[PDB]
Amino acid sequence: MRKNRAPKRTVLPDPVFNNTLVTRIINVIMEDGKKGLAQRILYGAFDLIEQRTKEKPLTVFERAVGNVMPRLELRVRRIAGSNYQVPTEVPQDRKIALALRWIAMFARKRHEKTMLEKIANEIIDASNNTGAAIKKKDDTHKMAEANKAFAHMRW
Amino acid sequence: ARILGIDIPNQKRIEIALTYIFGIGLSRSQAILKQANINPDKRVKDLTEEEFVAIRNVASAYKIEGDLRREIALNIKHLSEIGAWRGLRHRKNLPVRGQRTRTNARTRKGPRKTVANKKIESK
Amino acid sequence: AKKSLKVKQTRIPKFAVRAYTRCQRCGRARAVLSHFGVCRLCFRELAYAGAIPGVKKASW
Amino acid sequence: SRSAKKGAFVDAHLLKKVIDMNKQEKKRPIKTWSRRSTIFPEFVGNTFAVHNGKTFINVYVTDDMVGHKLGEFSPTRNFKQHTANR
RNA sequence: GCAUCUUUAGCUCAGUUGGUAGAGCAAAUGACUCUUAAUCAUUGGGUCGGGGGUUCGAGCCCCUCAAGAUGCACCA
RNA sequence: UUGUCUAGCGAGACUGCUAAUGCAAAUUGGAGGAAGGAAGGGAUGACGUCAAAUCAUCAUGCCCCUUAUGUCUAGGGCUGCAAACGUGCUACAAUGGCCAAUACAAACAGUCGCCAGCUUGUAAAAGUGAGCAAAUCUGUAAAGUUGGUCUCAGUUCGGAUUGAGGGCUGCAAUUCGUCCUCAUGAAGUCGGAAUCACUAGUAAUCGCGAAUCAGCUAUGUCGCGGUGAAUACGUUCUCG
RNA sequence: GGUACACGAAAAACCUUACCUAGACUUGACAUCCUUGGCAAAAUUAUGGAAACAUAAUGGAGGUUAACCGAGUGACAGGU
Ligand SMILES: *C(=O)[C@@H](N)CCCC[NH3+]
Ligand SMILES: [Mg+2]
Ligand SMILES: [Mg+2]
Ligand SMILES: [Mg+2]
Ligand SMILES: [Mg+2]
Numbered sequence: 159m160r161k162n163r164a165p166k167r168t169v170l171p172d173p174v175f176n177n178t179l180v181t182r183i184i185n186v187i188m189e190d191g192k193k194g195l196a197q198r199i200l201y202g203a204f205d206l207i208e209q210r211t212k213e214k215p216l217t218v219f220e221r222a223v224g225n226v227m228p229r230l231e232l233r234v235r236r237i238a239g240s241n242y243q244v245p246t247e248v249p250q251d252r253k254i255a256l257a258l259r260w261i262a263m264f265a266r267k268r269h270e271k272t273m274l275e276k277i278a279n280e281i282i283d284a285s286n287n288t289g290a291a292i293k294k295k296d297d298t299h300k301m302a303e304a305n306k307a308f309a310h311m312r313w
Numbered sequence: 314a315r316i317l318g319i320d321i322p323n324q325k326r327i328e329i330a331l332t333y334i335f336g337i338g339l340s341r342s343q344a345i346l347k348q349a350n351i352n353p354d355k356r357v358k359d360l361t362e363e364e365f366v367a368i369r370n371v372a373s374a375y376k377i378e379g380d381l382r383r384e385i386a387l388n389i390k391h392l393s394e395i396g397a398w399r400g401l402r403h404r405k406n407l408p409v410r411g412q413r414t415r416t417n418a419r420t421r422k423g424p425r426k427t428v429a430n431k432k433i434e435s436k
Numbered sequence: 437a438k439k440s441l442k443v444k445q446t447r448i449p450k451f452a453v454r455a456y457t458r459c460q461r462c463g464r465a466r467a468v469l470s471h472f473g474v475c476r477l478c479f480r481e482l483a484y485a486g487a488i489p490g491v492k493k494a495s496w
Numbered sequence: 497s498r499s500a501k502k503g504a505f506v507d508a509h510l511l512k513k514v515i516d517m518n519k520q521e522k523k524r525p526i527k528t529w530s531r532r533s534t535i536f537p538e539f540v541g542n543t544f545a546v547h548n549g550k551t552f553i554n555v556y557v558t559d560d561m562v563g564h565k566l567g568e569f570s571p572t573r574n575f576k577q578h579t580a581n582r
Numbered sequence: 583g584c585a586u587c588u589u590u591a592g593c594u595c596a597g598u599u600g601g602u603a604g605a606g607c608a609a610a611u612g613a614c615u616c617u618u619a620a621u622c623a624u625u626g627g628g629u630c631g632g633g634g635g636u637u638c639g640a641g642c643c644c645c646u647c648a649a650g651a652u653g654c655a656c657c658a
Numbered sequence: 659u660u661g662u663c664u665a666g667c668g669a670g671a672c673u674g675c676u677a678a679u680g681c682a683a684a685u686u687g688g689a690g691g692a693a694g695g696a697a698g699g700g701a702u703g704a705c706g707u708c709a710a711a712u713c714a715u716c717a718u719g720c721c722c723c724u725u726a727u728g729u730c731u732a733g734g735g736c737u738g739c740a741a742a743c744g745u746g747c748u749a750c751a752a753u754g755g756c757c758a759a760u761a762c763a764a765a766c767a768g769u770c771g772c773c774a775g776c777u778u779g780u781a782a783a784a785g786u787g788a789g790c791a792a793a794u795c796u797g798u799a800a801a802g803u804u805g806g807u808c809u810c811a812g813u814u815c816g817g818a819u820u821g822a823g824g825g826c827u828g829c830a831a832u833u834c835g836u837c838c839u840c841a842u843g844a845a846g847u848c849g850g851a852a853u854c855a856c857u858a859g860u861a862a863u864c865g866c867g868a869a870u871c872a873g874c875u876a877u878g879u880c881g882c883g884g885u886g887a888a889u890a891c892g893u894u895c896u897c898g
Numbered sequence: 899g900g901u902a903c904a905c906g907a908a909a910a911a912c913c914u915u916a917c918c919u920a921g922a923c924u925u926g927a928c929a930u931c932c933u934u935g936g937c938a939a940a941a942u943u944a945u946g947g948a949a950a951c952a953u954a955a956u957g958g959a960g961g962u963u964a965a966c967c968g969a970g971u972g973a974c975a976g977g978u
C-alpha cells in the first residue's frame with residue numbers, strides 16, 4: 159500500500175578502530191540522546207577487554223558479534239488459530255542490526271556492576287559461544303528448524 | 314554504635330551516619346560536623362574516643378532525637394485540643410494543607426477500597 | 437448579568453487588587469489581550485477587517 | 497509565612513469592639529463577620545460569633561487559641577457520609 | 583365440628599419476638615432526551631382487620647368477634 | 659582574528675541538457691550545481707454529512723420575570739470525597755545521586771518594568787543603586803568536559819506526607835497563594851489483559867523565552883535553540 | 899465515541915462569578931425620548947457601621963451649559 163522503498167542514511171566509519179559497526183552499537187546503547195556518554199561507556203569496555211583478554215579489542219568484538227549473528231528469521235503469519243511461523247533468510251544489514259540489539263538488551267540486565275563492566279562481560283562472554291545472546295540465537299534457530307515444513311508457504 | 318540508642322552503620326561515613334539518627338538529617342549533620350571540626354570522609358569504624366565525646370556533646374546541645382517524636386505528638390494533641398478546623402482535617406486522616414481530595418492524595422488514605430460505580434443503562 | 441459588570445469595571449474600585457480588565461468592544465472578561473484591550477474573539481473579527489495596522493496572517 | 501514588618505492583622509473594627517467589650521463587664525457574644533482577624537492577646541476571655549457562611553457559630557477563645565485566625569476555629573462546609581451508587 | 587394459621591400504605595410481602603413499621607411494584611416529582619420508552623435520583627402515601635385485657639409502653643403477648651385458608655371426622 | 663551579521667532588492671532550479679522508452683503526457687539514470695524532479699516547513703481546507711458545538715464572546719425571532727429571574731455589598735462556594743476514568747509531571751537509579759571547576763545557543767521581552775554591581779542573610783530575599791525605552795543595559799543556559807566520592811542498599815535512590823521557623827505579593831494567604839531553610843522519609847526495584855505517538859534534525863531528551871498575571875505545585879499553552887538516533891523486507895492480516 | 903475530559907478558562911483568596919447565606923435598592927448600577935433648571939459628580943476626612951449605605955464637612959475640573967449634574971416624567975432600562 160506504499161509501493162516505495164525507504165532510503166538509507168550513512169553508517170559512518172568508526173572514528174577509532176575504523177570499523178563502522180562500532181558507531182551502530184553506540185547508537186544502540188544510546189539512551190536520553192547522549193552521544194558523548196555512550197561513546198565513553200563503550201570505549202571504556204574495550205580498555206577493560208585489553209586488561210583481561212590481552213588481545214585486540216576490535217578482533218574480540220567482531221568474534222563476539224559475528225558469532226551472535228543469526229541466520230534464520232521467523233515471521234508470524236496467523237490464518238485461523240495461533241500463528242504458523244515461516245523461516246526466511248534475513249538480509250545482511252538486518253543481520254548485524256539484530257545482533258547488536260540483542261547484545262545491548264541482555265547487557266543491561268546482567269547481575270554485574272557499572273554498565274561498562276556489564277557490557278564488557280557480555281561481549282567477552284559471547285566470543286566463546288556461551289552467554290545470554292547466544293541462547294537467544296540458539297532458540298530462534300531451533301524454532302525455525304522445527305518449523306521447517308511451512309517455510310515454502312510465505313504469502 | 315555508641316551514640317545514644319542509635320546504631321549508626323559501622324562501615325559508613327560519619328556524615329551519613331548522623332543522618333541515620335532521627336533528629337539529625339543531612340544538612341544539620343554537616344553543621345555538627347563542621348562545628349566539631351572533625352573531617353568528613355573518615356569511616357566511623359576508623360574513629361577514636363576523642364571525636365565520640367565531642368559529637369555526642371553537640372548532639373545533646375541540639376534537640377534530642379527522642380524528644381522530637383513526643384514534640385510532634387504534643388503538637389498534634391495541641392492542635393486537636395484547640396478544636397481547629399485544621400486539627401479536624403488532620404483528625405480524619407486527610408490532607409492538612411490545601412491538597413485536593415477528589416481524585417488524588419492517597420498517601421494519607423492508605424490502600425484503595427474500591428466501591429461500585431453508578432450503573433449507566435443509557436438515557 | 438452583563439451590563440452591570442461592564443459599568444462596574446469602568447468605575448474605580450475601593451481596592452487596587454479589585455480592578456480587572458474586560459474587553460472594551462464586548463463585555464467578555466476572560467482571555468483579554470492587554471496589548472490591545474480586545475478579547476480573543478473580537479480580535480479575530482477586527483484582524484480580519486484590517487482595523488489594527490500591521491496584524492497580518494502568519495506563515496512563520 | 498506572613499512577613500515580620502507587617503506583623504499581625506485585625507480589621508480594627510473587631511479591635512475597637514473588643515476594647516469596648518472588655519471594659520464592659522456584662523459581656524455577650526460579639527457578632528463579627530471577620531474570619532480574617534488574627535486572635536490578639538486582648539481577645540482572650542471573649543466569645544465571638546463567626547459567620548460560617550450560613551449562621552454564626554460561637555467560639556469561646558482561650559489563652560491557648562491565641563495566634564491563628566478567628567475563622568480557622570469554625571467550619572464552612574460539611575461532609576459526613578457518602579451513598580452507595582449502585 | 584375441632585384444632586391451627588393469616589388479615590400490615592393503591593397491590594404483592596418482610597416486620598420481632600414489647601419502646602409503637604419498612605422491602606419490592608404501582609403513582610407522582612424532577613433529572614435525562616427533538617420528545618418519549620427505558621434509566622436514574624428523590625418522594626408523599628399506614629386506622630398494623632375490629633374491640634377488650636396485661637404492661638410505664640402492644641404491629642409484637644393473651645381473649646372475643648368479622649372475613650378466608652390449613653390440618654384433623656361428611657361414623658371403620 | 660574584517661567581512662560575519664542584520665534586512666531591502668535581485669540572481670539562482672526551469673525535467674533547463676543528456677541516455678533509455680513512450681504517439682504524448684511522463685518515469686528512471688547521469689552531468690553540472692548550495693539545492694533535481696511538489697528542495698524541507700507554514701498559511702491556504704470544494705459541494706456537503708453528523709438537526710455535530712456554541713443563545714455563557716457578540717447579535718437576534720419567540721417565550722418568561724418586571725419593588726424581581728433586575729441592582730450594591732460582606733461572608734462562604736466554584737478547591738468537598740467511600741470512589742472510577744483521561745491527559746501530564748516525578749520516579750523506581752551507577753547511561754546515576756551529590757560536590758567543585760568550566761565551554762558552547764537561538765528566539766523573545768522590558769520604565770508601576772528588566773534589574774547589573776555592592777552590603778546583609780544557612781536561603782527565599784531586603785537595602786543601596788547605577789544602566790537601559792533598547793543590535794548599546796538586563797533577564798546566571800542546562801545537558802555536555804575534567805576531577806573527587808558513593809559501590810547496587812529500598813540506599814548518598816525516590817520525593818510524598820507531616821511539624822516548626824522565615825521571605826515576597828496583596829486590604830487580606832484559615833477555608834484557598836507560592837518560594838526558601840530545617841525536621842520526617844509513603845508507595846515505588848520497570849508495571850496484568852490491552853493500548854499511544856513518530857519516517858531526520860524527526861522520535862527521545864536538556865534548558866531558555868513569551869502570552870493572560872499584584873501573586874499563583876501552569877508539571878498547562880504557545881514558541882526558541884543544545885545533543886541527537888533506530889527502522890521501513892512487504893501488503894498475507896488490521897483500521898480508515 | 900472517533901470530533902468531550904491541562905476543553906470554554908491566555909491565571910477562581912477579595913475581584914473575576916454567572917452559585918448559596920445574609921444586610922440593603924426600585925424608571926433602578928447603565929441608556930434614549932420627551933417639560934424643565936443647572937451655582938456638580940468625584941475623591942477624601944468624621945460618626946454609626948461586615949461592608950453595602952446613611953447622616954456632617956473642603957463644596958470644588960469646568961463652562962453658564964458644552965459633556966454631564968440634575969428635578970418631573972411615563973414609554974421603559976435590565977436578565978450569564
Ligand atoms: C372409627 O373410627 C370409630 N372408632 C370412631 C367412632 C366415633 C363416634 N363418635
Ligand atoms: Mg490548592
Ligand atoms: Mg450577554
Ligand atoms: Mg434540552
Ligand atoms: Mg493551494
Ligand SMILES: [Mg+2]
Pocket residue numbers: none
Ligand atoms: Mg442537537
Ligand SMILES: [Mg+2]
Pocket residue numbers: none
Ligand atoms: Mg466571595
Ligand SMILES: [Mg+2]
Pocket residue numbers: none
Ligand atoms: Mg477546577
Ligand SMILES: [Mg+2]
Pocket residue numbers: 746
Ligand atoms: Mg506536556
Ligand SMILES: [Mg+2]
Pocket residue numbers: none
Ligand atoms: Mg559520577
Ligand SMILES: [Mg+2]
Pocket residue numbers: 794
Ligand atoms: Mg558592548
Ligand SMILES: [Mg+2]
Pocket residue numbers: 812
Ligand atoms: Mg518498598
Ligand SMILES: [Mg+2]
Pocket residue numbers: 816817
Ligand atoms: Mg530523592
Ligand SMILES: [Mg+2]
Pocket residue numbers: 831
Ligand atoms: Mg496558607
Ligand SMILES: [Mg+2]
Pocket residue numbers: 847
Ligand atoms: Mg534494582
Ligand SMILES: [Mg+2]
Pocket residue numbers: 857
Ligand atoms: Mg511519514
Ligand SMILES: [Mg+2]
Pocket residue numbers: none
Ligand atoms: Mg522525559
Ligand SMILES: [Mg+2]
Pocket residue numbers: 901
Ligand atoms: Mg463529538
Ligand SMILES: [Mg+2]
Pocket residue numbers: 915
Ligand atoms: Mg467570588
Ligand SMILES: [Mg+2]
Pocket residue numbers: 937
Ligand atoms: Mg459652579
Ligand SMILES: [Mg+2]
Pocket residue numbers: 936962963
Ligand atoms: Mg442656564
